Write a protein that binds this ligand. Structure first.
Ligand SMILES: Nc1ncnc2c1ncn2[C@@H]1O[C@H](COP(=O)(O)O)[C@@H](OP(=O)(O)O)[C@H]1O
Ligand SMILES: Nc1ncnc2c1ncn2[C@@H]1O[C@H](COP(=O)(O)O)[C@@H](OP(=O)(O)O)[C@H]1O
Ligand SMILES: [Ca+2]
Ligand SMILES: [Ca+2]
Lengths: 281, 281
């Protein structure tokens, strides 16, 4: 019923996910866990499918890759789904570093992080707010854009999220990937994931993973497109989860006025950062 | 009902497996197939389980690894089971090179062959003849030993089998392994299989494969011990498939007289061969 967001340590989150944090400090990480970390709508489902295939030598995605802080009225908790989970475990989270279960850092769990350009994230997040009913109603795109720029959306600021994890990468095992690089050359990025997780697969098998993990395929696959969930939960008729999967599509939504204001605000928040994003390709 | 063996191109075989050869020249091999080749009771099930785990990133074994020439009164044909089989395929065969579907050689299919010392093979084969009722009754061990030395058992001569494939290894991709080496150092042999099939797995995961593919484990696992099959097919009460899994246990069955005769006969059949087997460890 589109419940307002709950702030936690300065971070606004889905009411339910906020409640799920208590049961969350009990969580104990294993040395062989693989943590998939991302700001919302940055390629989480995409890299999850890739990692899952890899872990199977080549049920829906949300069952195979437990969502750490997950929790919803008529659905099993993220930590629940993780109980019936044998090692090695693939985990998923969008949690900022201030809310991340300390155990993951203490065990040096390998992290595959994916960052996506902020403009495409914003548009993708606006449409998701519409279809996923656990989120407060977004309002107009104009108002949502403002909330997104002020980090007044679920999981907080995108600017801080991509920067903190980028910095964490200096003293913690982290493979920091870019949604755009994955778009441009999927095989290249999958090979980087294989090497990073200490695995190898014949060229032929990787080429097959590239075909099956393409937007087109993943949009048909009911195990990856989230269509098996209930309508009053996610209304694919409003906006499909597998919306467009493009890089640079934000140009058909941002007005010139909004783009000018966003860029100015951006340069100001990404000043001292060495992170470089490309909004096209 | 213990039907006599059928000779084919000079090779005696299970009546049913003989019949299964016709439907067999229709078989078409793919470039990515992986062929597990062995003379009977040489570690086929063992290396099959290992390869299957590898192919899954770490149903019973006979369903997951189709048995090429398989065929039995109340059970689906080997090529049948292979129809519902997606690439990449793991295949199993005990066929001598004269009966091997040419397509496997023409496609350069990777072969993992396992050889075991003849004395342990003989004893293991004698007990298998007893429990598996598709084989003619073995008779006494004394008589079986003689039949085994004369290649008058299913799949013919062991001497020729281990030599021809050893030679094939010079002009065809073949990883020739020894049952004994696998006993002595399983991790070492599994790493050789990984490299050979162009795969890689973290050390920790391989150590886990070594534990689960040990004789003890595989003897409990109903998916690998063949206990789900029907009794009038295989009578585990007569002799369990997972008998002992030892190297050098042939000393408790061979009499000194039989051993002296076997050695003399052996030196004569393995003369010009560079193959070296160790009957202990
Ligand atoms: N295989 C794939 N290739 C490209 N984009 C994909 C993809 N699977 C999902 N996506 C896109 O990733 C976004 C969702 O990411 P997440 O899984 O983190 O929530 C959506 O972006 P759009 O809204 O821009 O289409 C979605 O269409
Ligand atoms: N994991 C394992 N480790 C050691 N030996 C194994 C094994 N799995 C099966 N075996 C042994 O391999 C032989 C059967 O081989 P195959 O699978 O080729 O028919 C039997 O030998 P014994 O009769 O000597 O015990 C069996 O016990
Ligand atoms: Ca989701
Ligand atoms: Ca068998």
């Amino acid at each position: 019923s589109r419940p307002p967001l709950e702030y936690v340590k300065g971070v606004p989150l889905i009411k339910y996910f906020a409640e799920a944090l208590g049961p969350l400090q009990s969580f104990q990480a294993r040395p062989d866990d693989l943590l998939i970390s991302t700001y919302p709508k940055s390629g989480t489902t995409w890299v999850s499918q890739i990692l899952d295939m890899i872990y199977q030598g080549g049920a829906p995605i949300f069952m195979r890759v437990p969502f750490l802080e997950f929790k919803v009225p008529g659905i099993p908790s993220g930590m629940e789904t993780l109980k019936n989970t044998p090692a090695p475990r693939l985990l998923k989270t969008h949690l900022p570093l201030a809310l991340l279960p300390q155990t993951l850092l203490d065990q040096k769990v390998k992290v595959v992080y994916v960052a996506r350009n902020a403009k495409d994230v914003a548009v993708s997040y606006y449409h998701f707010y519409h279809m996923a009913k656990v989120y407060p109603h977004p309002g107009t795109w104009e108002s949502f854009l403002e909330k997104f720029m002020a980090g007044e959306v679920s999981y907080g600021s995108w600017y801080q999220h991509v920067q903190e994890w980028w910095e964490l990468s200096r003293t913690h095992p982290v493979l920091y990937l870019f949604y755009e690089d994955m778009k441009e050359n999927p095989k290249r990025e999958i090979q980087k994931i294989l090497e990073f997780v200490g695995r190898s697969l014949p060229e032929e098998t990787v080429d097959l993973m590239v075909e099956h993990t393409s937007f087109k395929e993943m949009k048909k696959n009911p195990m990856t497109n989230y269509t098996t969930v209930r309508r009053e939960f996610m209304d694919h008729s409003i906006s499909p989860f597998m919306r467009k999967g493009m890089a640079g599509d934000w140009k058909t939504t941002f007005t010139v006025a909004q783009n000018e204001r966003f860029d100015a605000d951006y340069a100001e928040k990404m000043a001292g950062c060495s992170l470089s994003f490309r909004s096209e390709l």
